[PDB]
Structure formats: C-alpha cells, structure tokens
C-alpha cells in the first residue's frame, strides 16, 4: 500500500537537481518508503505540515537526523532545544525566544543595516565579486559573531562547524563520515566559547547565561544553549541570502520591482527562503503506530520530511517554481512549523531584509558572469560560488 522508491535523497545526483525527484516523491503518494535508508518519506505540503505539528507522535528527542538515539549514540551531546520534546523543550525554548525576541531586534537593527549598506558599497567598488564568499558569507560573519559576543580569534571554525552539524543529520555516507573525521578542532573551539567568561557582555551568549538566575535554565544548561546559536543560523542564513541574490539575477523583473519598492525587501527574502529552502530535510521518529495519509507507520520508525518539496508542492502553491517577491508566503515550512519553528527566524529575516534593502537602493543590475558552483550538504541547499557583476544604481 506504500510505494517503495530507490531514490537516495542524500546522493550528489539528488543534490545537483532535486526538483524532478521531488515531484516523483510527491506524486508517488502521500507517504513513501525509501529502500535506500529504510525510512518513511513525506514530500507533500499537507503531510509535512501535519508531521511538524504533531510533536507527540513524531518526536524529536530520538534525533532529527537519520540516526535513532535509542539505537545509536549521538555524535555530540544532544541539543537542549532541537533534540528535545515537551515539556523538556519548553523552558530552553522560552529562553532562546526571549534572547532573540522582537525587543532584542530593536537593539541590533541599526548596526546590522549599517554593515549591510557598507558591504554593498564595498562590493560596488570591486564590481565583479563572488556573491557567496564576498556577500552571502561575508555579511553574516560581520554581524552575527559580534552580536553573539564572540572574540575575534578562532572565528574560522564557525563555518566548518555549521557544515558539520548539518552534514551529521544525514545518513552515514561519505559527506557525513568525512565531516566527523575532521570535527575535533571545531568542536573544541565551539565548546570553549560557550562558557560564560568567553562571551562579551550584552551579546546573545551572555544574555543566555543571565537567564540562569530566573529558574528557566540552570547554569550547567547555559553552555549547551549557547552551543545552539553556534550550530544553527550561520549556514542557513548564508544559503538563504545567496539564493536571494541568485534569484534576483535569474529573475531580473523581480529585482526591478524590488528597486522600485525597497520595502518589499523582507518579503523578497522570505520568498527566497521558500524558493530555496536552505534547510531541505530533517527527520522525526514515531512514538507509536500512526495513520498518516492512509498509511500505517509503526512505532520507532524514522520519517523524512522534504521541506523544500513541501514549499514547491503545486497542491499548495500557485506557480511554485517561480520567484515572486509579492507572493503571500505565510505558511511556508522553510522555517519549520509548530513548537520547534525556528527560534532565530527574527535574526535571519533581519539579516536578509537589510541586505536586500541595501541592494535595492544601491544596485541597478546583477549579472552572472561566471560558472555557478553548488555546495553539497546532506541537509542544506546552497551555492559554493556565484560570480556576479554588480552595476551601481
Ligand atoms: C534562512 C535562515 C534559517 C532557516 C531556513 C532555518 C531553518 C530552521 C528550521 C526548518 C527549523 C526547525 C527544525 C525542526 O523543526 O526540527 C529551525 C530551528 C531552529 N533554528 Fe533556524 N533557520 C534559520 C535561521 C536561524 C537563525 C538565524 C538561528 C539563530 C540565531 C537559528 C536557530 C535555530 C534553533 C536554535 C532552532 C531549534 C528551535 C527549536 O528546536 O525549537 N535558525 N530552523
Ligand atoms: O544546535 C542546535 O540547537 C540546532 C541545530 C540544528 C538545528 C536545525 C535547523 C534546521 S534543521 C536543524 C536547530 C538547532
Ligand atoms: Cl560540539
């Protein structure tokens, strides 16, 4: 009653062009079985949204990667928020929600917008730039580590640790195993910076340690919570920003609309998060036998959610393969949905908005002038290189 498919969603062939295989997954049925890794798969919007919003049946405490924590040991101590279920998840989630609150955004918006304007001006002086290394990567590195309160030394570990974390959500393929092989230096840097003395006052990390006085987290819980903000946030925002630039270059009509109304910058980034979905997939584990879309799934089974596919499901979106900066994007699952829906989504939207705004006001044309190269990751979708010409407005 369940179609069995041989598609490997963690193969380089799939990473190169996942959209045809995603339709095959959506059109085979609401629930598929992937014989390659012995997991259930859901690629339609309705089933992805259903799973994300039933955390009791589809839990996260047994890991949101392929590995089942009841069967194998986690490659690192489990995150206190991503890899936790209610009620254990609730109080750590509330701390990160207050640390990255709408009120917190007010204290950092002017500095984030200034660095974005300054980077665009710098790149306009060069003309031909790599929109990944020089823009998508450079800008978040120039605002987020300082907003965390991280010292200057050792910041070169942040990007490799981010790519390791998301590679480790995948199956034990070469991408995952080679990432873990090289992980020891990045783990040691990240864990050390999580200690309260190493986090500058006023920053995100120091604000997490300050919540230990309230009874929501204990002092021994703070370093792991800080670790969450050194694991998530970086590569997703880089990939999302890089995808928005790529879209603005592939769809010149949308850049012209953004230039004419720079207040569309926020929705232009949100639509890029839907169009690209920097986080393509992750897992849940069933805690009981469950019927999902006419399919009986046993207890203790891994369920693979295709976020990017759900964001392009024609059963939910009109013209999903088109980048439309005025699209009603509310309801996309690029940030997830339910109790685990990205706690840093306000930081990501701010970073994306102020960068697209700086582009909207200072740039007249964005033209690809070189070979585009993909960056391969078991969980993340994004570009390795995007050579573009920036024409000043
Ligand atoms: C374009 C940018 C981003 C995307 C696409 C993204 C994506 C996601 C998704 C899909 C989830 C849900 C995971 C799940 O349900 O299992 C999530 C959770 C999370 N994200 Fe993001 N994220 C982004 C930016 C950020 C930023 C900037 C931060 C921190 C500053 C961050 C930190 C977190 C954390 C800590 C969680 C776990 C929340 C929880 O378990 O309740 N993310 N993210
Ligand atoms: O270290 C953490 O707490 C953490 C790590 C990864 C994610 C994430 C985001 C989209 S898929 C998985 C969330 C939180
Ligand atoms: Cl670690």
TrEMBL record:
Keyword set includes Heme: yes
UniProt-recorded Gene Ontology molecular function terms: heme binding; iron ion binding; monooxygenase activity; oxidoreductase activity, acting on paired donors, with incorporation or reduction of molecular oxygen
Keyword DNA-binding appears in the UniProt entry: no
Cofactor entry: heme
Coiled-coil residues: none
Stored InterPro entries: Cyt_P450, Cyt_P450_B, Cyt_P450_CS, Cyt_P450_sf
Keywords: Heme, Iron, Metal-binding, Monooxygenase, Oxidoreductase
Residues at which heme b binds: 89, 93, 284, 340, 342
Similarity comment: family membership: Belongs to the cytochrome P450 family.
Protein name: Cytochrome P450
